[PDB]
Amino acid sequence: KIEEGKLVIWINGDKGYNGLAEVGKKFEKDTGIKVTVEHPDKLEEKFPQVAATGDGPDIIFWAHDRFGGYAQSGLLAEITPAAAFQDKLYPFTWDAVRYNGKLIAYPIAVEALSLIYNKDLLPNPPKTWEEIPALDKELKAKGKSALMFNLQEPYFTWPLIAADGGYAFKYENGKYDIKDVGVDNAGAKAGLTFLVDLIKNKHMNADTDYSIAEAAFNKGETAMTINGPWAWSNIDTSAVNYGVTVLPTFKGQPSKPFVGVLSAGINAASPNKELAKEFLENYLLTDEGLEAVNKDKPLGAVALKSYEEELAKDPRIAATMENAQKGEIMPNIPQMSAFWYAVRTAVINAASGRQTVDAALAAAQTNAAAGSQTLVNSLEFLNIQKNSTLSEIRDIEVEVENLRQKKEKLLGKIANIEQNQLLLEDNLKQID
Amino acid sequence: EGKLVIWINGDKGYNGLAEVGKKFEKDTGIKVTVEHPDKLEEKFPQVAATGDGPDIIFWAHDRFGGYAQSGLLAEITPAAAFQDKLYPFTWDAVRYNGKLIAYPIAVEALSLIYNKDLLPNPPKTWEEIPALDKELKAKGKSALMFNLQEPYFTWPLIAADGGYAFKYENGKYDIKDVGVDNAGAKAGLTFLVDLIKNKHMNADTDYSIAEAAFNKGETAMTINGPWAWSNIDTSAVNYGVTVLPTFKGQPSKPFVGVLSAGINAASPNKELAKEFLENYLLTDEGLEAVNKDKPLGAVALKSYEEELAKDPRIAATMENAQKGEIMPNIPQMSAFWYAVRTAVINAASGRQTVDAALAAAQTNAAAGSQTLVNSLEFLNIQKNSTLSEIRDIEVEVENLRQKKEKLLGKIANIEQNQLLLEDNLKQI
Ligand SMILES: OC[C@H]1O[C@H](O[C@H]2[C@H](O)[C@@H](O)[C@@H](O)O[C@@H]2CO)[C@H](O)[C@@H](O)[C@@H]1O
Ligand SMILES: OC[C@H]1O[C@H](O[C@H]2[C@H](O)[C@@H](O)[C@@H](O)O[C@@H]2CO)[C@H](O)[C@@H](O)[C@@H]1O
């Protein structure tokens, strides 16, 4: 299971996992505990599968949006940093990781999507989505293309969907109404329609994913991309002159990225709970840990006031936080994965051309309205956790029965010894 | 839309299938479009729930009971004359709750495929394959590689010693008696994971990696269906198709699939699709056209199977099929397959023990009544989608009714005028 005496850490393959593993060498070269940093596929879906059986990593890194489901499923340990540690991180980053009054993870860095443009194929990035087609017609005349970004994950297409009024769960009076879902409304329809019209007019391709878009931009084949800070590393080494700027407006309104706070939770099945705490607070969440990670793949606007006051002078970080301000902080409520799955389907099926935008989003709206899928999903993981726990109990009872069998055989040995002692003590009394 | 669009999976002979689409277009002039989208079996119900998707969908029969329960498949209406051209047991695979829900095309089963120059005889047992891999490793080769990402391919071994999906007895399936947890399933999956731990296979091998290695002569054995024989033909590896090895002395038990063609319930071209399938595909000419692209296996059309049955590769196919089981077509199959995919991937990667992986899958698959909620979801989507078409029509009707009312105004006023002129005329 989760071997005790070591820390295993999961973080997504696009993050600075090699830089994080350097913070693991320091932990291992300093405290002797070994640290293994892995980047599995579909990490956010494997974690609850294995953690439900007491397996998985000690620490799981993901944006805070997924952690409310992990918590409701009972898979997360209680985070308990001291008030002294709390004043080192911006309070709004602690806000992202608070669910029903408990801190369910440590905030690390603030992520938001920005516009990234090739400084030499385009001297000024377009201020509006609406001008991007004309730019692409011109740019293709030179053998290049205007824009390429990942169309497979709704994270990347939502800023445009949300611009004119799309929303996940209505947020009002400080609370989300999970039956007021806004993926159906006219704003959402107009955004996805513009996107599918871009595809159908041959300005982008529905088959484009993350790898194809990064390859295309870093080779000077596309004028613009949409991505987070992690992507800056690979663009640096391509010797492309790139700028990071505000996302284009749509119908006169800013694109609204959903803002992620990359967070570290501690597996509820971890025996190394306090070892994990010390790693995060006194190794990761410091200038040298964060800088080691950050120089692998930039983290974005880190939550630690100490190192952030230094990264904030990067113009790319300001442009990140300006885009972040125009968007909305993602909810962390359990229904987010259900929301994300509904919107993922819609975008792929509308982009593929085999469903209309109107039909795709009407389906997604009703699906997302079924947010009581997360109750069934949490109950499922809890029923796996229970059966696994009963199984450990039965193993213990076999151990106890074996021991009990040895004991009974020893008591038998003693019974026979006592027979002898009675015999010899009578033999001795008669010599007397 | 006056044309036929068809979905079929990318490992099938879609190029050959399109040739039958031309021969359809040259006779009726109707265009035939053959696409092989990824995850078609999962996209289909998403889009058909809103009245979209393809006209015809090709997949193994196991998925069609869920499509039918969600109300997304048209009732097939073969004439008694046409029904007697197909083996009756292939009709049973596509029969769900008394209705025929698709046309059967071909019977599929996995076989062992081995390099006859790397191996004089296929192994009789799974248990000897490690020793064989060692001997081969010393020569720069490997014993066995097959797709480990899809539970379809690992099931023959999982079932060998007693694993099963849903218990079948008295003619019906008990969807609460699930056999992915039992000692037979565990022993099969444990053997698979030990192969990986001992470096005889790699948990990341998938379909593409395994085919390449075998067709390049890099590995002595693979496990695959008939669709794969074409590419091995063009590679000039000397290969045999044979019965799978035994495990713990018992036959491997592959799940048998009947490639089937369903007709979308929202298709306006239902009769064209019927005509395409009955009188173009399901004939000695059409099945041969597909079969020459990528072999189909044992086709359902008695006339063309009589010829195929002479191919020893088809005999070995049918011998493997007989040791296995025809897959259920019940709605719970998708939940079953997803649960077992999870277990195999998580245990093969080493993140979970076999016991824990399969205990979780057992409890998941035991909740197969997520297919009832899932169908109820698709139906309420279909209903809401339909109500919107209705509301669009009713706007057209009210507009037309307003245009009418305005014309009745013109007529009323003309009659006023006529009254004036006709009395003024009676005075004159
Ligand atoms: O639904 C898409 C996806 O959006 C976010 O995932 C992001 C992640 O937050 C980023 O750090 C980066 O890794 O890209 C991911 C998308 O590819 C949500 O955090 C995630 O839950 C959601 O599924
Ligand atoms: O995966 C290759 C193989 O997959 C199919 O078998 C499926 C089954 O039919 C599906 O419902 C799926 O979810 O489970 C098995 C894969 O794990 C096809 O039957 C076969 O033709 C195709 O090549």
Give the burial string for B49-84 (b: 16+ CB within 10 Å, else e).
bbbbbbbbbbbbbbbbbbbbbbebbbebebeeeeee
Give the nearest chain A residue to B363 (CA atoms). Answer: A384
Backbone angles phi, psi at B222, to 5 degrees: -140, 170
CA pair distance A125, A131, nearest whole angstrom: 10
Nearest partner of A355 among B411, B374, B53, B319, judged by Cα: B53
Structural tokens at position A83: 């008030």
Structural tokens at position B351: 């993140």
Q: What is the Å distance from ligand 2's center to B9 Cα?
A: 10
CA pair distance A107, A304, nearest whole angstrom: 9
User: Is A362's CB within 8 Å of B385's CB?
Assistant: yes
Q: Which ligand is nearest to the CA of A41?
A: 1
Q: What is the 3-state secondary structure (H, E, C) of chain B?
A: CCCEEEECCCCCCHHHHHHHHHHHHHHHCCCEEEECCCCHHHHHHHHHCCCCCCCEEEEEHHHHHHHHHCCCECCCCCCHHHHCCECHHHHHHCEECCEECCEEEEEECCEEEEECCCCCCCCCEHHHHHHHHHHHHCCCCEEECCCCCCHHHHHHHHHHCCCEEEEEECCEEEEEEEECCCHHHHHHHHHHHHHHHCCCCCCCCCHHHHHHHHHCCCEEEEEECHHHHHHHHHHCCCEEEECCCEECCEECCCEEEEEEEEEECCCCCHHHHHHHHHHHHCCHHHHHHHHHHCCCCEECEHHHHHHHCCCHHHHHHHHHHHHCEECCCCCCHHHHHHHHHHHHHHHHCCCCCHHHHHHHHHHHHHCCCHHHHHHHHHHHHHHHHHHHHHHHHHHHHHHHHHHHHHHHHHHHHHHHHHHHHHHHHHHC
Positive or negative CA dihedral for A14, A19, A24, A28? positive
Strands B255-263, B325-326: parallel, antiparallel or unpaired by DSSP?
Answer: parallel
Sequence-distant (≥ 6) Cβ neighbours of residue A231 within 8 angstroms: A14, A116, A214, A225, A297
Asked whether B71 and B379 are in contact (CB, 8 A), the reply is yes
Asked whether A69 and A290 are in contact (CB, 8 A), the reply is no
DSSP per-residue letters across A227-261 = E-GGGHHHHHTTT--EEEEPPPEETTEE--PEEEE
CA pair distance A289, A285, nearest whole angstrom: 6
- Residue B93 CA, chain-centre distance (Å), reads 12
CA pair distance B85, A391, nearest whole angstrom: 54
Asked whether B143 and B219 are in contact (CB, 8 A), the reply is yes
User: Is B50's CB within 8 Å of A387's CB?
Assistant: no
Nearest partner of A262 among A28, A43, A81, A6, judged by Cα: A43
CA pair distance A308, A302, nearest whole angstrom: 5
User: Is A366's CB within 8 Å of B384's CB?
Assistant: yes
User: Is B363's CB within 8 Å of A387's CB?
Assistant: yes
Nearest partner of B163 among B147, B149, B146, B151, judged by Cα: B151
DSSP letter for A64, please: G
Looking at this protein, which amino acid is placed at residue A9?
I
Pocket test for ligand 1, best of A15, A155, A348 (most atoms within 8 A of CB): A155
Structural tokens at position B276: 């395409």
Nearest partner of A203 among A275, A259, A126, judged by Cα: A126
Question: Is B364 near chain A, with CB under 8 Å?
Answer: yes
Looking at this protein, which amino acid is placed at residue B378?
F
Ligand 1, atom 19, residue with closest C-alpha: A63
Task: Tell me if residue A151 falls in helix, strand or coil.
Answer: coil
Burial class of residue A91 in the structure, from the number of CB atoms within 10 Å of its CB (0-12 exposed, 13-18 middle, 19+ buried): exposed
Ligand 1: nearest atom to the Cα of A210: 17
CA pair distance A251, A130, nearest whole angstrom: 8
**Nearest-CA distance A3 → chain B (Å):** 12
Looking at this protein, which amino acid is placed at residue A344?
R
CA pair distance B145, A390, nearest whole angstrom: 37
CA pair distance B243, B334, nearest whole angstrom: 27
CA pair distance B275, A249, nearest whole angstrom: 51
Query: Resolution, rounded to a tenth of an Å?
Result: 2.2
* Sheet containing B142-144, strands listed edge to edge, beginning at the edge strand earlier in sequence: B142-144, B219-224, B111-115, B239-242
Give how far Cα A399 sits from Cα of A219, A405, B353, Å.
62, 10, 20
Looking at this protein, which amino acid is placed at residue A86?
Q
CA pair distance A218, A225, nearest whole angstrom: 10
Q: What is the Å distance from ligand 2's center to B339 Cα?
A: 14
Nearest partner of A366 among B426, B239, B50, B244, judged by Cα: B50
**Which residues of chain A are within 8 Å of residue B383 when distances are taken between CB atoms?**
none
Task: Tell me if residue A167 falls in helix, strand or coil.
Answer: strand
Strands A222-227, A145-147: parallel, antiparallel or unpaired by DSSP?
Answer: parallel
